[PDB]
Enzyme design. Structure first.
Site, short mmCIF file in Angstrom:
data_model
loop_
_atom_site.label_atom_id
_atom_site.label_comp_id
_atom_site.label_asym_id
_atom_site.label_seq_id
_atom_site.Cartn_x
_atom_site.Cartn_y
_atom_site.Cartn_z
N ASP A 132 -0.48 8.28 10.45
CA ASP A 132 0.92 8.37 10.19
C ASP A 132 1.64 7.14 9.77
OD1 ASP A 132 3.56 9.30 10.69
OD2 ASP A 132 3.83 8.55 12.64
N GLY A 142 8.94 1.46 7.88
CA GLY A 142 8.16 0.20 7.71
C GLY A 142 7.08 0.43 6.77
N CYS A 143 6.87 -0.87 6.14
CA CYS A 143 5.86 -0.51 5.00
C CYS A 143 4.50 -0.97 5.27
CB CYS A 143 6.39 -1.52 3.80
SG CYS A 143 7.90 -1.11 3.13
N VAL A 144 3.55 -0.67 4.50
CA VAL A 144 2.13 -1.03 4.86
C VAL A 144 1.64 -1.79 3.71
CG1 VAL A 144 -0.18 0.08 5.31
CG2 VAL A 144 1.63 1.56 5.76
N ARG A 200 5.34 2.49 0.85
CA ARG A 200 6.73 1.90 1.42
C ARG A 200 7.29 3.41 2.10
N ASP A 256 3.92 14.96 13.33
CA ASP A 256 4.04 15.04 11.69
C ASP A 256 2.79 15.08 11.08
OD1 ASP A 256 5.75 15.06 9.52
OD2 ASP A 256 5.97 12.60 9.39
N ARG A 314 0.51 13.80 3.41
CA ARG A 314 0.92 12.31 3.14
C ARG A 314 0.68 11.43 4.29
NH1 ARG A 314 5.67 13.00 6.58
NH2 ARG A 314 5.85 15.24 6.47
N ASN A 315 0.14 12.04 5.56
CA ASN A 315 0.13 11.22 6.70
C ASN A 315 -1.54 11.06 7.07
OD1 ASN A 315 2.45 10.33 7.32
ND2 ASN A 315 2.74 12.09 8.48
N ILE A 347 0.77 -1.20 -0.17
CA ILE A 347 -0.27 0.01 0.03
C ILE A 347 0.68 1.12 -0.04
CG2 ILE A 347 -1.30 1.49 1.76
CD1 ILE A 347 -2.85 -1.42 2.14
C1 W3W Z 1 -4.03 4.74 14.76
C2 W3W Z 1 -3.12 5.48 13.70
C3 W3W Z 1 -2.85 7.11 14.12
C4 W3W Z 1 -4.06 7.88 14.05
C5 W3W Z 1 -3.66 9.23 14.22
C6 W3W Z 1 -2.60 9.78 14.43
C7 W3W Z 1 -1.44 9.02 14.67
C8 W3W Z 1 -0.14 9.44 14.86
C9 W3W Z 1 0.24 10.66 15.36
N1 W3W Z 1 1.61 10.95 15.48
C10 W3W Z 1 1.98 9.49 15.37
N2 W3W Z 1 1.08 8.70 15.18
C11 W3W Z 1 -1.74 7.48 14.39
N3 W3W Z 1 -1.68 4.94 13.72
C12 W3W Z 1 -1.03 4.55 14.59
C13 W3W Z 1 0.25 3.91 14.52
C14 W3W Z 1 0.71 3.18 15.64
C15 W3W Z 1 1.95 3.51 16.07
C16 W3W Z 1 2.60 2.94 17.15
F1 W3W Z 1 4.01 3.22 17.54
C17 W3W Z 1 2.16 2.00 17.97
C18 W3W Z 1 0.56 1.98 17.43
F2 W3W Z 1 -0.21 0.96 18.26
C19 W3W Z 1 0.21 2.18 16.57
C20 W3W Z 1 0.79 3.82 13.34
O1 W3W Z 1 2.01 3.32 13.10
N4 W3W Z 1 0.14 4.58 12.17
C21 W3W Z 1 -1.22 5.00 12.26
O2 W3W Z 1 -1.64 5.52 11.20
#
Ligand code: W3W
Length: 289
Positions: free
Chosen positions: A165, A40-42, A36, A147, A151-152, A34
């Site tokens: 993110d 880490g990748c999605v 890169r 951040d 893009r996020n 989805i």
């Molecule tokens: C729920 C979602 C999310 C929604 C709104 C804001 C943020 C955010 C704002 N500043 C950093 N992240 C993240 N989310 C969560 C993680 C995640 C990361 C972790 F390290 C641990 C964990 F359980 C989940 C991720 O990697 N990507 C992602 O989209």
């Protein structure tokens, strides 16, 4: 990659059990990428309650302190519930995975840059208002994004924008990627950072308001890269001298006024996300386009 669970604080390991998804409940499609990314990748995934989901691997995690933070974040995020915030379905520790809902229309930046989709100025202001609502919710939970950028943000099948993110902004905040040394690539996080974040590495809800202004500018330019002719090593001085992103061609004057207020050199003088929602809703509700 194997993680020593016994190197983690046992209290934290028990406190995160409600977020944990067992490996048998999840199938990851490692050949269906989805997005890169540096941390880490999605991938496409399939979860058993059959749910189509997005699975984010955590590639550059090297120490147990980063795994502890990852679990601490999972506990925080599991409680969030807002239509403009991406939900956390759960996490996997046995390499660590983040399980998110599947977002049909992908990331917001690629969506607005897409030739077929072609969103109108009104649609783009609507996307901005949805981001402000998701951020108003996160600010109410004292959650600092660090951040916020197009893009996020991701879009579902109904074109609902969800703040998310693709990096690890709250786990890997001390890494080189989030500093001025990351000078190559389109994702240059330093170009969304508030002036005080660039100088002291301090991130608050007021510095997320600055990033929100840059995100509104990305929406109005349909995904142009900000400050194309300003190097990552020169952005701090550029901003200190009072230079800003210029008003995009299709951007209504009251929306550029909002952007300039988000980029106030004094963090305390910037509007709150609650004020941003009121102001953007008023511009959107009387908009003809
Ligand atoms: C729920 C979602 C999310 C929604 C709104 C804001 C943020 C955010 C704002 N500043 C950093 N992240 C993240 N989310 C969560 C993680 C995640 C990361 C972790 F390290 C641990 C964990 F359980 C989940 C991720 O990697 N990507 C992602 O989209």
């Amino acid at each position: 990659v194997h993680i020593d669970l016994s190197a983690l604080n046992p209290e934290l390991v028990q406190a995160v059990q409600h977020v944990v998804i067992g490996p048998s409940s999840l199938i990851v499609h490692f050949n269906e990428v989805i997005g890169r990314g540096h941390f880490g990748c999605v991938y496409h995934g399939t979860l058993l309650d059959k749910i189509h989901c997005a699975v984010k691997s955590l590639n550059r995690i090297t120490d147990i302190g980063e795994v502890s933070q990852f679990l601490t974040e999972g506990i925080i995020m599991k409680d969030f519930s807002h239509p403009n915030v991406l939900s956390l379905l759960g996490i996997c520790l046995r390499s660590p995975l983040v399980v998110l809902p599947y977002m049909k229309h992908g990331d917001l930046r690629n969506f607005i840059r897409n030739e077929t989709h072609n969103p109108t100025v009104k649609d783009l202001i609507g996307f901005g208002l949805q981001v402000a609502k998701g951020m108003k919710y996160l600010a109410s939970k004292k959650f600092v994004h660090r951040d916020l950028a197009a893009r996020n943000c991701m879009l579902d099948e109904k074109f609902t924008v969800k703040v998310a993110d693709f990096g690890l902004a709250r786990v890997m905040y001390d890494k080189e990627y989030y500093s001025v040394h990351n000078k190559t690539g389109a994702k240059l996080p330093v170009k969304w950072m508030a002036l005080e974040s660039l100088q002291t590495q301090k991130f608050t809800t007021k510095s997320d308001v600055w990033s929100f202004g840059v995100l509104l500018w990305e929406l109005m330019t349909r995904g142009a890269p900000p400050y194309p002719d300003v190097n990552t090593f020169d952005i701090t001085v550029y901003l200190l001298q009072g230079r800003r992103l210029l008003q995009p061609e299709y951007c209504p004057d009251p929306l550029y006024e909002v952007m300039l207020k988000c980029w106030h050199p004094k963090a305390e003088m910037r509007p709150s996300f609650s004020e941003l929602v009121s102001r953007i809703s008023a511009i959107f509700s009387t908009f003809i386009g």
